[PDB]
Ligand binder design. Sequence first.
Ligand SMILES: *Cc1c(COP(=O)(O)O)cnc(C)c1O
Ligand SMILES: *Cc1c(COP(=O)(O)O)cnc(C)c1O
Ligand SMILES: [K+]
Ligand SMILES: [K+]
Ligand SMILES: [K+]
Ligand SMILES: [K+]
Ligand SMILES: [Mg+2]
Ligand SMILES: [Mg+2]
Ligand SMILES: [Mg+2]
Ligand SMILES: [Mg+2]
Ligand SMILES: [Mg+2]
Ligand SMILES: [Mg+2]
Lengths: 316, 316
Amino acid sequence: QACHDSLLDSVGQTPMVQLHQLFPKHEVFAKLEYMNPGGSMKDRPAKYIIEHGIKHGLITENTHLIESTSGNLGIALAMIAKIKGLKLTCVVDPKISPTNLKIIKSYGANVEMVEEPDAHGGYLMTRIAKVQELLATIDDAYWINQFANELNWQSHYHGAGTEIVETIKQPIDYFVAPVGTTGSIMGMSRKIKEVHPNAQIVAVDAKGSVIFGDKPINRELPGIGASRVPEILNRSEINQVIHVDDYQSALGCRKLIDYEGIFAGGSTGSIIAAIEQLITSIEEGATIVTILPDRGDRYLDLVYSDTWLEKMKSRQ
Amino acid sequence: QACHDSLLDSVGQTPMVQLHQLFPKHEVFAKLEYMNPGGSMKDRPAKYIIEHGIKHGLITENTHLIESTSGNLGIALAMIAKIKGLKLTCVVDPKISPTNLKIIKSYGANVEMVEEPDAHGGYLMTRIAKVQELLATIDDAYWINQFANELNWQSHYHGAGTEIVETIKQPIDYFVAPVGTTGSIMGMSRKIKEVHPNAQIVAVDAKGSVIFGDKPINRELPGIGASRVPEILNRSEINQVIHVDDYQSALGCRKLIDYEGIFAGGSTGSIIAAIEQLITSIEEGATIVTILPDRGDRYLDLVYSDTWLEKMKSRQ
Ligand SMILES: *Cc1c(COP(=O)(O)O)cnc(C)c1O
Ligand SMILES: *Cc1c(COP(=O)(O)O)cnc(C)c1O
Ligand SMILES: [K+]
Ligand SMILES: [K+]
Ligand SMILES: [K+]
Ligand SMILES: [K+]
Ligand SMILES: [Mg+2]
Ligand SMILES: [Mg+2]
Ligand SMILES: [Mg+2]
Ligand SMILES: [Mg+2]
Ligand SMILES: [Mg+2]
Ligand SMILES: [Mg+2]
């Protein structure tokens, strides 16, 4: 191993682990994106978007980064911004995890907490409006714009997507990924299908997410699911869509830690639930590749709380 | 990169990063032990002790692991126990981090919380007694015994110690490590001095820790510092001892994240404070190697709480 000159050099090249115990009749490979130094998969677009902007003169040391975020992208941006010497303001709402908020603040990022919900309860439109307000009033700014920025999916194309095809050189029969912005499934599937053109691309979403037009219900988990259809998404590149509810997702997390000792976050539970559904239809022995976006540490009062689990069971 | 057959294969081979910004006049290399898959340096002894016991027939699938622990070793043991199919009971007290406790429980470990303090307030003697009670009543048990188990320092000798000398082949002028059980500084210094016999070995402890006979005061940080002199410790192998108080440690954490974007735990702050003291005495340009045991995520209500920081400032 060589010395890194900064923490940036340890982004990527994350482990790939076969889930022998959880999936004894298929060859299931899990890309451990949560082992990125910032703690989640969002290290990939944070590093890639900011470095691209700097290289091409859109971002200088004077440029103020702006984004509306839940925890994970906020934390990743804050880490990269801090390393690069850039100001960052995260637009957030009162639904953000209290611990994720403290982490963002620890990295020295500014936080703009919106307080007014719309007449109907959501803070989405309020956050959208606050981002535009900041772009109007903070001179020299760069909007990360994760739902529309092509650099998002490109980061995953060059990131785990490239590492997946280097490692899993055997045919990939199914690639299974959770969706939020869809940057991950778009970028990784594009890279995968260059090498494995017959790979089936399987999106996993939360029940109540509007990405693929499910009927909206209250959703507890971050990361997976969205309240908008992302501009990034090209539906024709998706071959199968599986929705999983929050109880299902949480059971998936608890099963993964029980069977493999892997302590992962909500959306990882979602893809465990979805792969268990998928394997009732596909061929025994299939090669399945998936990604595990973040750690269980960010879900102690969600998935890994027994009282929360019982409440989600009741929602079914 | 190759596929791992389990999470165990991703223990170790952690990044080494030069701290160019924080230490512009010395060559300071930080071993990122917090990037172990379980989240801290304690992955090393947990894996090594348990695998050694299994190899040598002291531990079978029926053997119940016992240890009195604060968070980090408890979490690491729980992860390894879960992967190996072993029962684990952690003896803990009410001072344990609420979040670390939830993490231990998430990994399916049993928890024995002691409630009676001694007449003088500490739970140390109560925990010591509870461990012996469990060893008496739980047939087929294995006491991890971290303060006395030679496998503790051996794990660090074979672990980061070996990786440090492989990577830092240039002369190591100073090796700086925090002490708790002293397994890390004993094992790593032993390996380092095989290659670099003139390396000076610098222990960093918390003010109020009795490891090197400081006057006891109330201590806020886990990991670094102890309320016993560890059997593992051989003082003759220590060349310099620096004590740092909790305010100093916390300023070190905040400076490290501000200068390098590295979000590390309390004892990392301790060794930043200690290295800043050390460099007032040593030669410019010296090569210093250190270890960063855990992440800032476990210190949001400690080091990274502004109100907590002000309270520690008042303790000086
Ligand atoms: C970002 C994220 C996702 C979804 O990834 P996208 O690239 O936005 O589709 C899933 N889970 C977690 C935890 C995430 O942070
Ligand atoms: C265990 C630990 C230490 C001290 O290491 P020892 O090998 O026990 O001396 C320091 N910091 C943290 C966070 C630890 O968990
Ligand atoms: K927006
Ligand atoms: K959304
Ligand atoms: K004990
Ligand atoms: K102690
Ligand atoms: Mg097999
Ligand atoms: Mg300006
Ligand atoms: Mg990358
Ligand atoms: Mg230099
Ligand atoms: Mg028995
Ligand atoms: Mg090791």
